[PDB]
Amino acid sequence: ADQLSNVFQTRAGCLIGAEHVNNSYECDIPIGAGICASYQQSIIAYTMSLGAENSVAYSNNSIAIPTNFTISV
Amino acid sequence: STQDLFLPFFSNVTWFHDNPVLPFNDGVYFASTEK
Amino acid sequence: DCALDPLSETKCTLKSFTVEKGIYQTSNFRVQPTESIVRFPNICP
Amino acid sequence: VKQLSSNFGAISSVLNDILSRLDPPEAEVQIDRLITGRLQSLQTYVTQQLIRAAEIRASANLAATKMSECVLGQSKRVDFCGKGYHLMSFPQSAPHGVVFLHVTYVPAQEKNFTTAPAICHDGKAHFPREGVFVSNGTHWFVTQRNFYEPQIITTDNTFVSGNCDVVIGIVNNTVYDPLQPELDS
Amino acid sequence: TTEILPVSMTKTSVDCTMYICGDSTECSNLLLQYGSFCTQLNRALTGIAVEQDKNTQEVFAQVKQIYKTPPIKDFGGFNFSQILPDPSKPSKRSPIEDLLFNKVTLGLTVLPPLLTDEMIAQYTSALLAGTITSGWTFGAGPALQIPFPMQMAYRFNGIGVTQNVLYENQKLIANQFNSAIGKIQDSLSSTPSALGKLQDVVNQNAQALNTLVKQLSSNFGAISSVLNDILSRLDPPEAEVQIDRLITGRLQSLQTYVTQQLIRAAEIRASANLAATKMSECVLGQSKRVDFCGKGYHLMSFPQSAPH
Ligand SMILES: *[C@@H]1O[C@H](CO)[C@@H](O)[C@H](O)[C@H]1NC(C)=O
Ligand SMILES: *[C@@H]1O[C@H](CO)[C@@H](O)[C@H](O)[C@H]1NC(C)=O
Ligand SMILES: *[C@@H]1O[C@H](CO)[C@@H](O)[C@H](O)[C@H]1NC(C)=O
Ligand SMILES: *[C@@H]1O[C@H](CO)[C@@H](O)[C@H](O)[C@H]1NC(C)=O
Numbered sequence: 319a320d321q322l323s324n325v326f327q328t329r330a331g332c333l334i335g336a337e338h339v340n341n342s343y344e345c346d347i348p349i350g351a352g353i354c355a356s357y358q359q360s361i362i363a364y365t366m367s368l369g370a371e372n373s374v375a376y377s378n379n380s381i382a383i384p385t386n387f388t389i390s391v
Numbered sequence: 392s393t394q395d396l397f398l399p400f401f402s403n404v405t406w407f408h409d410n411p412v413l414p415f416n417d418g419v420y421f422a423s424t425e426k
Numbered sequence: 427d428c429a430l431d432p433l434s435e436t437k438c439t440l441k442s443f444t445v446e447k448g449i450y451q452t453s454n455f456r457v458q459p460t461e462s463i464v465r466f467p468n469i470c471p
Numbered sequence: 472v473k474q475l476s477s478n479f480g481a482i483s484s485v486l487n488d489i490l491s492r493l494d495p496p497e498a499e500v501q502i503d504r505l506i507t508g509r510l511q512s513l514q515t516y517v518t519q520q521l522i523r524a525a526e527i528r529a530s531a532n533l534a535a536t537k538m539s540e541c542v543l544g545q546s547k548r549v550d551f552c553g554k555g556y557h558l559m560s561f562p563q564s565a566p567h568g569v570v571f572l573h574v575t576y577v578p579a580q581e582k583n584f585t586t587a588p589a590i591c592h593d594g595k596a597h598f599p600r601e602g603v604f605v606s607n608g609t610h611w612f613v614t615q616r617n618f619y620e621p622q623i624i625t626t627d628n629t630f631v632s633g634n635c636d637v638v639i640g641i642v643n644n645t646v647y648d649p650l651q652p653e654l655d656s
Numbered sequence: 657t658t659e660i661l662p663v664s665m666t667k668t669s670v671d672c673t674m675y676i677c678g679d680s681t682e683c684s685n686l687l688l689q690y691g692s693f694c695t696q697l698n699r700a701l702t703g704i705a706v707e708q709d710k711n712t713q714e715v716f717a718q719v720k721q722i723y724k725t726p727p728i729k730d731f732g733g734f735n736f737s738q739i740l741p742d743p744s745k746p747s748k749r750s751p752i753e754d755l756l757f758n759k760v761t762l763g764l765t766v767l768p769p770l771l772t773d774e775m776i777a778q779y780t781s782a783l784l785a786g787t788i789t790s791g792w793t794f795g796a797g798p799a800l801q802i803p804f805p806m807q808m809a810y811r812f813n814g815i816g817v818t819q820n821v822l823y824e825n826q827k828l829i830a831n832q833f834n835s836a837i838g839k840i841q842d843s844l845s846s847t848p849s850a851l852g853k854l855q856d857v858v859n860q861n862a863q864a865l866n867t868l869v870k871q872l873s874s875n876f877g878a879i880s881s882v883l884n885d886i887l888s889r890l891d892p893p894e895a896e897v898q899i900d901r902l903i904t905g906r907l908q909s910l911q912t913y914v915t916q917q918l919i920r921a922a923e924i925r926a927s928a929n930l931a932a933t934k935m936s937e938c939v940l941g942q943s944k945r946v947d948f949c950g951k952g953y954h955l956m957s958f959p960q961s962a963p964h
C-alpha cells in the first residue's frame with residue numbers, strides 16, 4: 319500500500335478519505351458499480367443520477383405545434 | 392528516474408552543538424552551519 | 427521521492443509533475459501469512 | 472528500442488563483448504539465445520500494428536460514407552449527420568483526419584391546442600391532404616405539422632372519403648366552398 | 657419480429673508476475689532479466705476493459721432526460737402492458753425482460769460493470785415512454801405531445817397508404833397488434849435456441865479462462881511442475897536453469913490468451929456500433945431503407961434490455 323480517516327465500504331472496494339452524501343448529482347469521475355466522485359474542499363462519493371425528470375402532458379385531444387426555429391452548427 | 396542510495400525526504404536528522412562516534416551505515420549526509 | 431505519498435506515486439508512474447483529474451492504478455497489494463503449522467497423522471519391540 | 476537494450480539472458484547485452492571477449496563456440500551459444508529474444512520483440516510489434524491498422528481502416532470507410540452522403544447531398548436517415556433535421560455540411564482538413572460542420576434545423580417555442588381527426592359537414596367526412604386540423608377556442612383551422620400557419624378550411628385542400636358514421640372522434644364544422652361558386656350569382 | 661445483438665463482454669484483468677512466478681523472489685529477478693513484456697500485457701487488457709464501458713454508454717444513453725408515461729392509460733385501444741415496466745415487483749422490469757433475464761443461465765480478477773441493471777432498465781423505460789407519448793419529435797428537439805391514433809395515421813401516410821384506411825379500421829388494427837405481442841412472449845419462451853448469441857459470448861470467454869489455468873499446471877519440460885521442488889530440492893544454479901525454461905513456457909501461454917482477446921474485442925465493437933445505428937434510425941424515427949428493420953414496410957420499434 320502507498321506509505322502514509324473515513325472508511326466507507328462500497329460495491330467495488332472501500333475508499334479512504336471520502337464521505338458519502340444522500341444527494342445524487344451528475345457523474346464526474348467514475349469509480350464503478352454505480353458510484354462517482356468529485357470535488358465539492360472535500361471528495362464526495364455519491365450514486366449517479368441518470369438525468370432531469372419530466373413528463374409530457376398526454377391527452378387524446380391535445381397537440382403541440384412549434385412557432386419558431388433555430389439553426390445550429 | 393534513477394534508483395540509488397538517497398536521503399529520504401522529511402526524515403529525522405540529529406542536531407549536535409567532545410563529539411560522539413557514530414556508525415557509518417552506507418554513507419552519511421554531513422552539513423555544517425554557516426559558521 | 428516516489429515512496430513518500432500516494433500523490434508522489436501517481437506522479438512517478440505517469441512520468442510527469444502535473445496530473446489531470448481522474449483515476450489511476452499505482453500498484454497492487456498482497457497479504458503475507460508470516461506463520462506455519464504442520465499436522466502429520468496422529469493416532470516397537 | 473528499450474527492448475533492444477535488454478540482455479534476454481546473457482553475460483552482456485552488446486554483441487561485441489560476447490563475441491571477442493569469450494571463446495568463439497560458447498560465444499555462439501550465448502549469441503543464439505540473445506537473437507531468439509530479439510526476434511520475439513519484433514514479433515509483438517508487428518502484430519500490434521496489424522490490429523491498429525484494421526481499426527483505422529474501419530474509421531476511414533466511415534468517413535468516406537459521411538463525405539458522399541452528407542456533403543454531396545441531403546440526408547434523410549436520422550441522427551447520422553447531427554442532431555435535428557439535416558440541411559448541409561462543410562468539409563475541413565486536419566493533420567491526420569477530417570472535420571465536418573453539420574448545419575441543422577431545430578424547432579422551438581411550441582404552443583398547444585386541441586385537434587380532431589376529421590370534420591363532418593353535410594353528412595360527409597373531410598380529411599386534410601397535408602397538415603392537421605387545429606382549433607383555438609371556438610374557431611377551426613388547418614396548418615402544416617412543423618410550423619404554425621393557420622388557414623381557412625376549404626373544399627380544395629381537404630379530400631372526402633366516406634360518410635359521417637364510421638370514424639371515431641369526428642366533430643362537426645362548416646367546410647367553406649371555393650370562391651368560384653360564391654362569385655357565381 | 658425479433659432481433660438480438662450483443663454489445664459487451666465481461667471485463668477481466670490479469671497480473672503478470674503473480675501468474676508467471678508467484679511468491680518466488682529469485683524467479684521475479686529472472687523476470688526483470690527478460691525485459692518489459694508483462695507491462696505492455698497489462699496495458700493491453702486495461703485498454704479493452706475501458707472499451708466495454710464505452711460500448712454500453714454509446715448504445716443506451718441516447719436520451720438526456722427521463723420521460724414518464726401518464727398514470728391513466730387510454731391509448732385508443734392499444735395495449736402496451738407487456739412492454740411497459742411492471743411496478744408490483746422488485747427490480748421493476750417488463751415481463752418480456754423478466755423472461756429474457758431468466759433464460760440466460762451462466763492472479764485473475766473480474767471488474768464490475770460501470771452501469772448496473774437498474775440503470776439500463778431505466779434507459780429502456782425512458783425511451784419507451786418518449787416514443788409512445790411524443791412520436792419521433794423528441795429525437796430532434798423538444799418533445800411535442802400527440803394522441804396515439806393520429807401518430808399511427810402519420811406513419812401510414814409514410815409508407816404510401818392514405819390515412820382514412822386507418823381511421824375506418826381502428827378496431828381491427830388494435831386487435832392485430834395486441835395478439836401479435838402476446839404471441840411473441842410465448843414463441844420466445846418455447847424454443848431454447850432463441851437466445852443463441854448472447855449465450856455464445858459467455859461460453860467462449862469462460863472456456864478461454866479455463867484453458868489458461870490448465871496451462872498453468874503443465875510442466876513445459878522439467879523434472880517437476882511446481883517451482884518449490886526445483887528450487888529447494890535441487891542445487892541453486894541448475895535449478896535456475898530449469899526455472900528459466902519453465903518461465904519461457906508460461907510466458908508463451910499468456911501471449912496467446914491476450915492476442916485472442918484482442919480479436920474478440922474487435923468483433924464485439926463492430927456489433928455494438930451496428931446496434932447503436934439500429935437504435936437511432938429505427939426507434940427514434942421511421943426507416944425507408946428496405947429490410948434494415950424487419951420484413952415488410954416499417955412502422956415503429958420497441959427497445960428491450962438483456963444481460964449482455
Ligand atoms: C442519509 O440516509 C441515511 C439512511 O439511513 C440516514 O441514516 C441519514 O441520516 C441520511 N442523511 C445523511 C446526511 O446521511
Ligand atoms: C395545453 O393547453 C391548455 C389549454 O389549451 C393549457 O391549459 C395547458 O397549460 C397547455 N399545456 C402546455 C402548454 O404544456
Ligand atoms: C381564435 O383565432 C381567431 C382567428 O382569427 C380569432 O379571431 C379569435 O379571436 C381567437 N380566439 C377565439 C376565442 O376564437
Ligand atoms: C378522450 O378522453 C376523454 C377523457 O375524459 C373521453 O371523455 C373522450 O371520450 C375521449 N375521446 C374519444 C374520442 O373517445
Ligand SMILES: *[C@@H]1O[C@H](CO)[C@@H](O)[C@H](O)[C@H]1NC(C)=O
Binds near residue numbers: 735736737
Ligand atoms: C392488456 O392485456 C392484458 C393481458 O392479460 C390484460 O390483463 C389487460 O387488461 C389489457 N389492458 C387493458 C387496458 O385492458
